[PDB]
Design a protein around this motif. Sequence first.
Motif, PDB file in Angstrom:
ATOM      1  N   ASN A   1      56.345  20.050  62.467  1.00 58.62           N
ATOM      2  CA  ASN A   1      55.154  19.207  62.432  1.00 58.62           C
ATOM      3  C   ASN A   1      55.503  17.737  62.239  1.00 58.62           C
ATOM      4  OD1 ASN A   1      52.867  20.807  62.972  1.00 58.62           O
ATOM      5  ND2 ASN A   1      52.786  21.547  60.889  1.00 58.62           N
ATOM      6  N   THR A   2      56.701  17.327  62.655  1.00 58.07           N
ATOM      7  CA  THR A   2      57.181  15.981  62.351  1.00 58.07           C
ATOM      8  C   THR A   2      57.219  15.065  63.571  1.00 58.07           C
ATOM      9  OG1 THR A   2      59.536  16.552  62.597  1.00 58.07           O
ATOM     10  CG2 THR A   2      58.573  16.774  60.403  1.00 58.07           C
TER      11      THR A   2
ATOM     12  N   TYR B   1      54.810  12.985  64.255  1.00 57.23           N
ATOM     13  CA  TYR B   1      54.291  11.729  63.727  1.00 57.23           C
ATOM     14  C   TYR B   1      55.424  10.806  63.300  1.00 57.23           C
ATOM     15  CZ  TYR B   1      55.282  13.442  59.073  1.00 57.23           C
ATOM     16  OH  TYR B   1      55.902  13.906  57.951  1.00 57.23           O
TER      17      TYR B   1
ATOM     18  N   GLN C   1      50.777  18.006  59.221  1.00 59.64           N
ATOM     19  CA  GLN C   1      50.651  16.954  60.221  1.00 59.64           C
ATOM     20  C   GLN C   1      50.032  15.715  59.593  1.00 59.64           C
ATOM     21  OE1 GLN C   1      48.791  18.509  63.719  1.00 59.64           O
ATOM     22  NE2 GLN C   1      50.421  19.963  64.048  1.00 59.64           N
ATOM     23  N   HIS C   2      50.518  14.545  59.998  1.00 61.94           N
ATOM     24  CA  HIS C   2      50.222  13.290  59.328  1.00 61.94           C
ATOM     25  C   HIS C   2      49.882  12.221  60.347  1.00 61.94           C
ATOM     26  CE1 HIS C   2      51.467  14.844  55.448  1.00 61.94           C
ATOM     27  NE2 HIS C   2      52.532  15.340  56.044  1.00 61.94           N
ATOM     28  N   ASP C   3      49.695  11.011  59.846  1.00 71.03           N
ATOM     29  CA  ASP C   3      49.334   9.867  60.654  1.00 71.03           C
ATOM     30  C   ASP C   3      50.564   9.016  60.943  1.00 71.03           C
ATOM     31  OD1 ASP C   3      48.161   7.017  61.141  1.00 71.03           O
ATOM     32  OD2 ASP C   3      46.449   8.324  61.297  1.00 71.03           O
TER      33      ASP C   3
ATOM     34  N   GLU D   1      50.315   5.573  59.432  1.00 64.43           N
ATOM     35  CA  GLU D   1      50.502   5.617  57.994  1.00 64.43           C
ATOM     36  C   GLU D   1      51.974   5.756  57.632  1.00 64.43           C
ATOM     37  OE1 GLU D   1      47.894   8.323  56.225  1.00 64.43           O
ATOM     38  OE2 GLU D   1      48.347   7.726  54.183  1.00 64.43           O
TER      39      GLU D   1
ATOM     40  N   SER E   1      44.613  17.342  63.972  1.00 64.81           N
ATOM     41  CA  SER E   1      45.849  17.934  64.448  1.00 64.81           C
ATOM     42  C   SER E   1      46.163  17.415  65.840  1.00 64.81           C
ATOM     43  CB  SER E   1      45.788  19.473  64.445  1.00 64.81           C
ATOM     44  OG  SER E   1      44.874  19.967  65.391  1.00 64.81           O
TER      45      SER E   1
END
Lengths: 330, 77
Positions: A13-14, A16, A103-105, A108, A271
């Motif tokens: 999930n990286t 971002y 999962q991230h921004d 950010e 997502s």
Amino acid sequence: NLLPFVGLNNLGNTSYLNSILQVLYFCPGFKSGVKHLFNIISRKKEASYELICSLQSLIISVEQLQASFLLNPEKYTDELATQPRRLLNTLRELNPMYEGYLQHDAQEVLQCILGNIQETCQLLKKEEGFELVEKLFQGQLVLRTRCLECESLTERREDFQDISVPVQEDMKTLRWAISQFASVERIVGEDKYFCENCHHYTEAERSLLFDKMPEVITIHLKCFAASGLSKINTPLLTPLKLSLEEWSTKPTNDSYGLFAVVMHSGITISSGHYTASVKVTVQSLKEYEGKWLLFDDSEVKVTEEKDFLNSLSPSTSPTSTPYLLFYKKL
Amino acid sequence: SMQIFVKTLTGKTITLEVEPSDTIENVKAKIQDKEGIPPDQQRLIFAGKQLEDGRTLSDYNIQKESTLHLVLRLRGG
Ligand SMILES: [Zn+2]
């Protein structure tokens, strides 16, 4: 058919972080600034520094994989990629939200990395190229307010590291978005301004003006809406060259050129997938100058200028929504 | 008590009456009163730095006529 450009393996999930790390690897001056800071820190250690150390390790890993592929392109069949494991560790130390595999921004995590580099620089300077982030990504805004009663003007100075523009009013261009950000807006009704000269609530005009300019302009696209939060998948018509003189405190001839785009794929905001497009600026590494690399984690595609610009168009409704645009000073 | 500006998701500016001692959580609750966005979906940017829950506006040196920028989180990976 592998290109000599090192992708980054998805560690769960990286993407971002991956697309941001690609845009930063190709940002003009960021590698040199990190190498300078790491030289300083290493002399200090032979006499908080972990973001710099792990970014320097990642940068050297990317460089050495590129070199070894260019030396023996036969030992490399499936992909030319590396893993940013140590730097993800350092980001989880600096900020506990990155612990795990959520999962991230992208904006950010970019803001986190750049803020921490700036804090490290301020520490090194206070203890004593210590203005890497300030010269590359930081500018000045002048935020002017005009009372519509007394017609007096108040000003503010604020720093910025990116311009957050809207993509929708509630086909449009980036110029429209930047006007919605900086052109004179008139705040009225429930959002009346409190004027201290009138000692009253008044209507007011606000406008923003770019004062001091970075070497890299980041446009953060607000591709999201509230009614109930949704994603806006229709892009703006994005230009290749940008001038900010229309919203500058002084006349300028300094124009900017698009060199990197971070895209989001997904029908929701909770997502999706992040990909980076990068413009390329030993003889084998010049058949790529002026061409656009698409970084899909460990996979690296090449693209021509005109095809890339077409794929961005709102008319050819793309599934990758532009989210971060990067313009460097020409 | 001071007035600050928040530039929202459409670029449109709203106002808030705040204290230097209000926390980022309270600012986000007022933004929810005006905009309808839950405070856990809100990211607030002032002068290039994101405002962290648990701090106050005086921690960040936010004064009268300071402008926050409200963005959301586009999650991906
Ligand atoms: Zn007045």
